[PDB]
Design a protein around this ligand. Structure first.
Ligand SMILES: CC(=O)OC[C@H]1O[C@H](S(=O)(=O)N2CCC(OS(N)(=O)=O)CC2)[C@H](O)[C@H](O)[C@H]1O
Ligand SMILES: [Zn+2]
Length: 257
């Protein structure tokens, strides 16, 4: 099925998933000069102190850090949202080179990686139902640039050799995702989609203005992961990003001047 290679990558996805050419696909380029400041946009409310991480999984396209979402433990509200959204997992997209890796771009500029914290709207009861709704998900996107290390990321980096290949998982309890956040919660927001198949148009994107910096060693270790399963020929997990998609009718709003 689908992947990030020349024969199964983003240019191929529309054959299995026609919505790939839809009207609200993600990611997009964020043209900062055309995004309009909205003084009515509320501050984001990120309540992560009761977050309960469980497990980290190599699913063959990225690694997911999963949380207990059976209860309102770690939630996203406010900002452009009018509901409560539970954190279910986070993951990254990254490049083979420091100059590429992010899915969203800012004035056509690419970051080395992008963090997605994935939340679903509790009025729909579970994640499976939520992705079938236009307002089912809220994804907090955070850019990574290469520079100084991010201490709050190191526990993630540390465990990656225990989940080198597709289908491997490891215990990952007591991880605090607050350690992955930049100082500012200033953001851009627009309506979009999952950036991987099935590419459902169910996401309110909230992309933070301020990137976090990670060390070259930290992203280096991301790139030692494998797309393949154990015992299969090694394919390095790199360049697992979808490129920017046409903005079409949409307007990106900024929480800040
Ligand atoms: C339809 C549905 O129930 O979930 C959508 C898909 O995605 C999640 S995921 O936990 O791996 N993950 C969720 C959303 C992530 O999208 S992201 N890149 O835009 O915000 C990527 C994959 C799972 O992989 C599911 O197997 C897969 O079906
Ligand atoms: Zn993602």
């Amino acid at each position: 099925h689908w992947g990030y290679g020349k024969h199964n990558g983003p240019e191929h996805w529309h054959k299995d998933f026609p919505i790939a050419k839809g009207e609200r696909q993600s990611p997009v380029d964020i043209d900062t000069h055309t995004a309009k400041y909205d003084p009515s946009l509320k501050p984001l409310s990120v309540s992560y102190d009761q977050a309960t991480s469980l497990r980290i999984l190599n699913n063959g396209h990225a690694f997911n850090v999963e949380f207990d979402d059976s209860q309102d433990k770690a939630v996203l509200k406010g900002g452009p949202l009018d509901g409560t959204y539970r954190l279910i997992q986070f993951h990254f997209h990254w490049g083979s080179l420091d100059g590429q890796g992010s899915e969203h771009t800012v004035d056509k500029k690419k970051y080395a990686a992008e963090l997605h914290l994935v939340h679903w709207n509790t009025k729909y009861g579970d994640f499976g139902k939520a992705v079938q709704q236009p307002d089912g998900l809220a994804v907090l996107g955070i850019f990574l640039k290469v520079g100084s290390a991010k201490p709050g990321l190191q526990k993630v980096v540390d465990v990656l050799d225990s989940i080198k290949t597709k289908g491997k998982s490891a215990d990952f309890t007591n991880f605090d995702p607050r350690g992955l956040l930049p100082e500012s919660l200033d953001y851009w927001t627009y309506p979009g989609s999952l950036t991987t198949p099935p590419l459902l148009e169910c996401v309110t994107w909230i992309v933070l203005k301020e990137p976090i910096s990670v060390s070259s060693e930290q992203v280096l270790k991301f790139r030692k992961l494998n797309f393949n399963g154990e015992g299969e020929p090694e394919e390095l997990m790199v360049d697992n990003w979808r490129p920017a998609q046409p903005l079409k009718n949409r307007q990106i709003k900024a929480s800040f001047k």
